[PDB]
From a paper:
Conjugative type 4 secretion systems depend on relaxases to process the DNA in preparation for transport. [name] from the well-studied conjugative plasmid [name] is one such relaxase.
Between the apo- and the DNA-bound state, the thumb moves up to 40 Å and undergoes important structural changes. The observed conformational differences include a reorganization of α-helix 8 and the extension of α-helix 9 (numbered based on the DNA-bound structure as one helix disappears in the apo structure) to transition from the apo to the DNA-bound structure, as illustrated in Fig 5A and Video 1. It is likely that the open conformation is important for oriT DNA to access the active site. The exact degree of opening observed in our structure is dependent on crystal contacts that stabilize the thumb subdomain.
Numbering used by the authors: 1 to 260, 272 to 306
């Protein structure tokens, strides 16, 4: 699944949790959850973990002490800072990785994001002029900062990476200019399919059987069912939002509504909820069908 959110000066505070949302995550306790990616990042000498100060300079176009982008033509509130390409795993893949466990699933997801980012670079464009005419140029380079989180805002298992594409690309003349985002935005389905294809291949290498849905071109873990996942999500929402049954009297409804923080405690709730629905996360590795191959 891929969602694209444009980050502007107006909504920049929406990224405030890019680091803190990972605070108590299992697979980044002693390991990186961020990375620099893209040929543009290489050009800037950026690799490995994303240092927040450098992220913030590039967010506003400060490439170096002597190179400062100017991109806002008009209302500075509308200046685009970058594009959050949020890649989320299928829910059952998330449940497997975050309730049962296997760091290989996290690595598969990050390989799939990196493959989609490499493909996104082919869509990078910038504007320039020739003979006084505005023209478009294919630049083949992006600057991307990735942030991996394990949970949704509702504290569901929800493995996802925010692949933050900076609003910059390096032109042929060597100048850094705003990204002309048209081709990026209109290839959301292609980039999401690249992620899905690479995730499915990496999970197959690790011996997980996948079930395929042809109508939606999606897949999930084969050893528990869509109905089981949907029931898990329903029960999760009951607990998260404190939903109560209806009461025949105001007094009973009031009392039921009134009645209804460690990751370890949250994990136990996940595990207990899945057990009660008959989910068995102990899959028969390297057994079963290959439904997603050649899809
Ligand atoms: Cl097993
Ligand atoms: Mn997140």
């Amino acid at each position: 699944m891929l969602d694209i959110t444009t980050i502007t000066r107006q909504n920049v505070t929406s990224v405030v949790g890019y680091y803190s949302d990972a605070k108590d995550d299992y697979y980044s306790k002693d390991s990186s959850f961020t990375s620099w990616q893209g040929t543009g990042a290489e050009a800037l000498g950026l690799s490995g973990d994303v240092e927040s100060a450098r992220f913030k300079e590039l967010l506003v176009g400060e490439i170096d002490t002597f190179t400062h982008m100017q991109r806002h033509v008009g209302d500075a509130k509308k200046e685009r800072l970058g594009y959050d390409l949020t890649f989320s795993a299928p829910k059952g893949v998330s449940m497997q990785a975050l309730i049962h466990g296997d760091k290989t699933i996290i690595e598969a997801h990050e390989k799939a994001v990196a493959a989609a980012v490499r493909e996104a670079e082919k869509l990078a464009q910038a504007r320039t002029t020739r003979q006084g005419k505005s023209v478009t140029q294919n630049t083949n380079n992006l600057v991307v900062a990735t942030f991996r989180h394990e949970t949704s805002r509702a504290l569901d298992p929800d493995l996802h990476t925010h692949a933050f594409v900076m609003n910059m690309t390096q032109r042929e003349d060597g100048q850094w200019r705003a990204l002309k985002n048209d081709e990026l935005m209109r290839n959301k389905m292609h980039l999401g399919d690249v992620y899905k294809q690479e995730l499915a291949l990496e999970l197959t290498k690790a011996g997980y059987e996948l079930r395929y849905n042809s109508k939606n071109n999606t897949f999930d873990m084969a050893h528990f069912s869509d109905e089981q996942i949907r029931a898990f999500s329903r029960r999760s929402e009951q607990i998260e939002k404190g939903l109560a049954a209806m009461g025949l009297t105001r007094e009973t409804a009031d009392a039921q509504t009134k009645s209804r923080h460690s990751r370890e405690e949250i994990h136990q709730e996940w595990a207990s909820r899945a057990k009660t629905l008959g989910i068995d996360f102990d899959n028969r590795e390297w057994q079963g069908a290959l439904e997603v191959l050649f899809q």
